[PDB]
Swiss-Prot record, chain A:
Keyword entries, A-Z: Ribonucleoprotein, Ribosomal protein, RNA-binding, rRNA-binding
Signal sequence, start to end: none
Full protein name: Large ribosomal subunit protein bL21
Subunit structure: Part of the 50S ribosomal subunit. Contacts protein L20.
Organism: Escherichia coli O6:K15:H31 (strain 536 / UPEC)
GO MF annotations in UniProt: rRNA binding; structural constituent of ribosome
Keyword Ribosomal protein attached: yes
UniProtKB/Swiss-Prot annotation, chain B:
Keyword Lipid metabolism: no
Keyword Ribonucleoprotein on entry: yes
InterPro entries assigned to the protein according to its UniProt record, in alphabetical order: Ribosomal_uL22 (IPR001063), Ribosomal_uL22_bac/chlpt-type (IPR005727), Ribosomal_uL22_bac/org-type (IPR047867), Ribosomal_uL22_CS (IPR018260), Ribosomal_uL22_sf (IPR036394)
Keywords, sorted A to Z: Ribonucleoprotein, Ribosomal protein, RNA-binding, rRNA-binding
Name assigned to this protein: Large ribosomal subunit protein uL22
Domain of life the protein comes from: Bacteria
MF term (GO), any: rRNA binding
Swiss-Prot record, chain C:
Gene Ontology molecular function, alphabetical: structural constituent of ribosome
Stated name of the protein: Large ribosomal subunit protein bL32
Keyword DNA-binding recorded: no
Family assignment from sequence similarity: Belongs to the bacterial ribosomal protein bL32 family.
Pfam families: Ribosomal_L32p (PF01783)
HAMAP family: Ribosomal_bL32 (MF_00340)
Swiss-Prot record, chain E:
InterPro entries attached to this UniProt entry: Ribosomal_uL13, Ribosomal_uL13_bac-type, Ribosomal_uL13_CS, Ribosomal_uL13_sf
Gene Ontology biological process terms, A to Z: negative regulation of translation; translation
Coiled coil: none
Protein known as: Large ribosomal subunit protein uL13
Gene: rplM
Taxonomic classification: Bacteria, Pseudomonadati, Pseudomonadota, Gammaproteobacteria, Enterobacterales
Molecular-function GO terms, alphabetical: mRNA binding; structural constituent of ribosome
Subunit structure as annotated in this protein's UniProt entry: Part of the 50S ribosomal subunit.
Organism annotation: Escherichia coli (strain UTI89 / UPEC)
Keywords in alphabetical order: Ribonucleoprotein, Ribosomal protein
Length: 103, 110, 56, 16, 140, 117
RNA sequence: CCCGGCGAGGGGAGUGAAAAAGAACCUGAAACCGUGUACGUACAAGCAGUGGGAGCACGCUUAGGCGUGUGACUGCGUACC
RNA sequence: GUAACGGGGCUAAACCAUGCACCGAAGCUGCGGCAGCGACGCUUAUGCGUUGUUGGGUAGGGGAGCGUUCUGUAAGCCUG
């Protein structure tokens, strides 16, 4: 099977895949809580039942994974002009990973 | 070491002798002389005693013999710019550098 | 009769391109061990037939 | 004496 | 992981062939160039490399707009000063369908490398079959 | 009492001086780079990065066009079908599927094509 | 002791914790100049960086498209004071 | 030196009218975070969850910081 669903950005493509994202909202952990994200898989994608749009019905979902909810990155990013160099700011958004239990 | 034999100053520029000792490098040791003893000018004699050194120096520090060897590294580095002053007309500036150069040449083997 | 910027290292050698001497291609003579200039004969003592200067 | 060990000899003793 | 679509270093090419003769003029250039980049092509993200061979034929037949045929001019300029500039008709230049009239196409595309030898991938000839001397090797 | 400002010396300079993607010359040799090279990048990265989400945007929707207009009907009419379709409608980057799983895409084209009043 | 011109200078050997401490001598940065190696480079236009980004060189994960120098090619794009 | 569409080219790829579709900016939206500031909950110096909101900026105003040397700190502490 294959997949797709959003919640910030439409990153979902691969199978389970273990792949980046955003996070919860109070602080990732590692474990999980078993938060199955909600329907949108183009009926997966694979199998003679390679169904068209998403819902061949309701209740075709996945499950969490909490692949490891952290990460820095850093990007310099600091402007300039011709009579002042604001040169001073960096601001990532943290991030959580995931390995989503397949469709 | 695999026997060395430098100079130290000797007096005669970086580029001037970086020339000469480019012919030497790779083959050599036996070819040392031949291709210096003929190839003309001055720069190319202040190598033909640092080669006779870097050979007797492999018959002392190193027990190696006068037919082997290789000349696996040469380079001429920038010795102190020996400075003075020239007249000219009115005076302005005469930087005049009497420029110099250390030698180091190294022979070893396959 | 003067430049305006600085002829970078890059160009330092883009004249120098051509120089890097070339050396020889020498031969011996029937009578010296392996000397001989490219035109003058035995350095080893000095001659070609015989009494060139002082020989044998 | 091999023409470099000769270029030696012949001189190292045009010394002695 | 992270998307974009890879484009090996190309890894795919072709062998098409198209007549021209039919008075289609210039408008042909378009898909004669998009198909030289990748229109119909819905894969192989260009912008970096890509390609797709074509071979046009004759060309010495393409009605051209309306009056254009008599008037349209080209101007080469040799720059060897002597005060150059070389006006020339469509009429007069169709007395030699080489690089031009069919190379009103090299101007519909990128220019610079890529867009450089991205256009030699055209091939011209001035009389289809009979002296379509090009690689017979399989066309469409 | 003293300062011998010479200790915060290169500590201030090496600081940026370490900007040697080559760059070139004193553009990573001296302090010509000063900022006049790093402060450069240091802005180029601001926009010409910020720019990418429209530089990969137009990207997809060239492919997206080539696809559906290679099945009949193009990125203009196409999206129209798609949008008129509530829960039934997602959006590019994945409308890149047309390059790893055609039929999938080719199927989307259907669903889009048919929705068309 | 050895090369050298009864030179410069240098190589061994001795000293000594150390000579990478050798007397032009403590630490030994920068501008600047060499030698080694890897990627790039002989149809290619500009403040030379940015976003892509292949490929090679390299270390990698009992794939999972990774770190590193590189950077063909292609979107912008005329240093500062 | 074409050189008075930017060009290639368009007899529509020009013009009038009409209409749907789409591309398009840092605008708006979504989403993860920063700070200043009024509210809700809670605790409760407080904060913190949320929440309304504001943060282009030269002359200049105001407010927090960073590190350099010396000083008690200290015959303390690192340190062959
Ligand atoms: Mg946008
Ligand atoms: Mg020292
Ligand atoms: Mg090339
Ligand atoms: Mg990159
Ligand atoms: Mg401000
Ligand atoms: Mg101010």
């Amino acid at each position: 099977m294959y997949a797709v669903f959003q919640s910030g950005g439409k990153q979902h493509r691969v199978s389970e895949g273990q792949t980046v994202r955003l996070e919860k909202l109070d602080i990732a952990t590692g474990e999980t809580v078993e938060f199955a994200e909600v329907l949108m898989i183009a009926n997966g994608e694979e199998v003679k039942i390679g169904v068209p749009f998403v819902d061949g019905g309701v209740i075709k979902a996945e499950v969490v994974a909490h692949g490891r909810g952290e990460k820095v990155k850093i990007v310099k990013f600091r402007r300039r002009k011709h009579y002042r160099k604001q040169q001073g700011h960096r601001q990532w958004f943290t991030d959580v990973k995931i390995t989503g239990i397949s469709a | 070491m695999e026997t060395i034999a430098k100079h130290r100053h000797a007096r005669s520029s970086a580029q001037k002798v970086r020339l000469v000792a480019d012919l030497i490098r790779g083959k050599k040791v036996s070819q040392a002389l031949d291709i210096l003893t003929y190839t003309n000018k001055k720069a190319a004699v202040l190598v033909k005693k640092v080669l006779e050194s870097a050979i007797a120096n492999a018959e002392h520090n190193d027990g190696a013999d006068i037919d082997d060897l290789k000349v696996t590294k040469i380079f001429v580095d920038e010795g102190p710019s020996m400075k003075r002053i020239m007249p000219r007309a009115k005076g302005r500036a005469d930087r005049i550098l009497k420029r110099t150069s250390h030698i180091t040449v190294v022979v070893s083997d396959r | 009769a003067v430049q305006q910027n600085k002829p970078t290292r890059s160009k330092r050698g883009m004249r120098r391109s051509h120089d890097a001497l070339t050396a020889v291609t020498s031969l011996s003579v029937d009578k010296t061990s392996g000397e001989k200039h490219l035109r003058h004969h035995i350095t080893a003592d000095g001659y070609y037939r015989g009494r060139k200067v002082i020989a044998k | 004496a091999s023409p470099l060990k000769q270029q030696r000899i012949r001189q190292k003793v045009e010394k002695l | 992981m992270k998307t974009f679509t890879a484009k090996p270093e190309t890894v795919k090419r072709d062998w098409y062939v198209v007549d021209a003769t039919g008075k289609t003029l210039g408008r042909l250039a378009t898909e004669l160039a998009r198909r030289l980049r990748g229109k119909h092509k819905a894969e192989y993200t260009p912008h970096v490399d890509t390609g797709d061979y074509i071979i046009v034929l004759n060309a010495d037949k393409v009605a051209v707009t309306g009056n254009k045929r008599t008037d349209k001019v080209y101007y080469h300029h040799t720059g060897h000063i002597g005060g150059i500039k070389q006006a020339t008709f469509e009429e007069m230049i169709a007395r030699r369908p080489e690089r031009v009239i069919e190379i009103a196409v090299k101007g519909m595309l990128p220019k610079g490398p890529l867009g450089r030898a991205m256009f030699r991938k055209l091939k011209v000839y001035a009389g289809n079959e009979h002296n379509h001397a090009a690689q017979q090797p399989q066309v469409l | 009492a003293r300062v011998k400002r010479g200790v915060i010396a290169r500590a201030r300079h090496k600081k940026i001086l370490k900007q040697a993607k080559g760059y070139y010359g004193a553009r990573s040799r001296v302090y010509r780079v000063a900022f006049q090279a790093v402060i450069k990048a240091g802005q180029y990265a601001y926009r010409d990065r910020r720019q990418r989400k429209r530089q990969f945007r137009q990207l997809w929707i060239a492919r997206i066009n080539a696809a559906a207009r290679q099945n009949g009907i193009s990125y203009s009419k196409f999206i129209n079908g798609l949008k008129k379709a509530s829960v039934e409608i997602d959006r590019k980057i994945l409308a890149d599927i047309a390059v790893f799983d055609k039929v999938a895409f080719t199927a989307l084209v259907e669903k889009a094509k048919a929705a068309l009043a």
